[PDB]
Amino acid sequence: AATVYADSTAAHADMQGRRLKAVSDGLDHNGTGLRVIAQTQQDGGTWEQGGVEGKMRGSTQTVGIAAKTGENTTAAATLGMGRSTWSENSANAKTDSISLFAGIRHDAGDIGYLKGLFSYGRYKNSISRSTGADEHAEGSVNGTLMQLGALGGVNVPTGDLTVEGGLRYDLLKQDAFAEKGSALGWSGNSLTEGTLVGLAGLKLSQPLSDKAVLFATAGVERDLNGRDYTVTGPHTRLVAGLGADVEFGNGWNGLARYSYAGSKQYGNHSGRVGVGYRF
Ligand SMILES: CCCCCCCCCCOCCOCCOCCOCCOCCO
C-alpha cells in the first residue's frame, strides 16, 4: 500500500485547480490597460482518499499580467511556483511545482462572456515513508499536469450577480520512479490520467465605493469521470467564499480572497492575497 504517491499527486492536482481559478478570476477585474499582479495563495485541508486520511498544506507564489487585447477581449498569463505537502499515517510528501497559466475571455458586449483557460506545469513529489523501526524509504517522482478550461458566464445585477459554468480537463502524465534507502522499497510505473470536471458558480459583487468591491461566491465542482492516481508497481463539492478588490491609488490595487471547499470526507481552506499594478 503505497497510497502515499496516489494521494500526494491527487493533492497537487486539487491545488492546481484553484491556481487556475485564480488566473481566471483575474480576467474579470480588468478595466483599462494592463495589470501586473503578484499573489500568494495558501491552502489547508484534510482529505480521506479511499480509506486513508491525510493533511494537505500548500503555498503558491504567482506573478502574472492581464490586459485588454481587444475591445471585447482580455488575456492573462501567469507563472506560478508552488510548494505543498501531504501527510498520512506512516508517510509524508512534499510537492514542488512550476506552472504557467493562460486565459482568454471574450465578451459578448455586456451580456456575458466565454473564457478559455490552459495551464502546463511540472511537479516533483518527494515522499518519505516509515517502513519499519527507524527505517524510511525515500522516493522522488516527476509529473506533468495540464489543464484545459472552457467557461461561459452571464452577468445579471444595486450590485452584480455573475453566473459561471463549464468544464476543466486535467491531463496528468506522471513518470516511473523507485524508492532508495529501504529493503522494502517500491517502484512504480508511469501513469497517464485524464479527468473532466464540471464547474458552476455564483459571484455576488457589491461595490462599496469607487475604490472597493466585496464579493461572495458559492460554487459546485465534481469530477465527471475517474480520477485515479494509483500507480502500478467522485463527489460533488460545495465551495463558499469571500473577497474584496481595493484600489489604493496611483495604479496600485490589493486583493483578498478566502474560500472553503467541502464534500463528505473532504474539506479545504483556500486563501489569497494579491497586490497589483495597473499601467
Ligand atoms: C514558493 C516560493 C516561490 C517564490 C518565487 C516567486 C514566483 C514568481 C514567478 C517568477 O516569474 C515572474 C514572471 O511571470 C510573468 C508572466 O509572464 C508574462 C509573459 O508575457 C508575454 C509577453 O507578451 C507578448 C505579447 O503577447
DSSP labels for 132-154? SSS-EEEEEEEEEEEEEEEEEEE
Residue matched to cell numbers 511545482:
97
Tell me the best of 36, 40, 63, 98 to mutate to test the pocket of ligand 1, counting ligand atoms within 8 Å of each CB and taking the most: 63
72 backbone φψ class: left, alpha, beta (φ>0; ψ -120 to 50): alpha
Residues 276, 257 contacting (CB under 8 angstroms): no
Q: How far apart are CA 144 and CA 175, in angstroms?
A: 9
| Full set of structural domains in the chain with CATH | 1-279 (2.40.128.130)
> What DSSP state is assigned to residue 33?
S
83 in contact with ligand 1, CB cutoff 6 A: yes
CB of 59 closer than 6 A to ligand 1?
yes
What's the gap in Å between 124 CA and the centre of ligand 1? 20
The dihedral over CA atoms of 50, 139, 172, 226, expressed in degrees to the nearest 10, equals -20
| From 61, 97, 120, mutation site for ligand 1 pocket: most ligand atoms within 8 A of C-beta | 61
63 lines ligand 1 (CB under 6 A): yes
How many angstroms separate the CA atoms of 139 and 203, rounded? 42
Q: Residue 78 CA: which ligand 1 atom is closest?
A: 16
Is ligand 1 within 6 A of the CB of residue 65? yes
Ligand 1 neighbourhood includes 73 CB (under 6 angstroms):
no
Distance 102 CA to ligand 1 centre (A): 11
The structure's method of determination equals X-ray
> Is ligand 1 within 6 A of the CB of residue 100?
no
109 contacts: CB under 8 Å, gap ≥ 6 = 72
**Three cell numbers at 188?**
512504480
Record the resolution, in angstroms.
2.6
- Which residue has the least CA distance to atom 1 on ligand 1? 82
From 223, 172, 219, select the one nearest 197 (Cα to Cα): 223
Quote the ligand 1 centre to 105 CA distance (angstroms).
20
> 204-237 burial, b if ≥16 CB within 10 A, otherwise e?
ebeeeeeeebbbebebebebeeebebbbeeeeeb
What CA–CA distances, in Å, run from 63 to 58, 148, 213, 218? 17, 20, 22, 26
CA of 63 to the centre of ligand 1 (A): 5
How far apart are alpha carbons 210 and 214 in whole angstroms?
12
Compute the distance between CA of residue 118 and CA of residue 163 in angstroms, rounded to an integer.
21
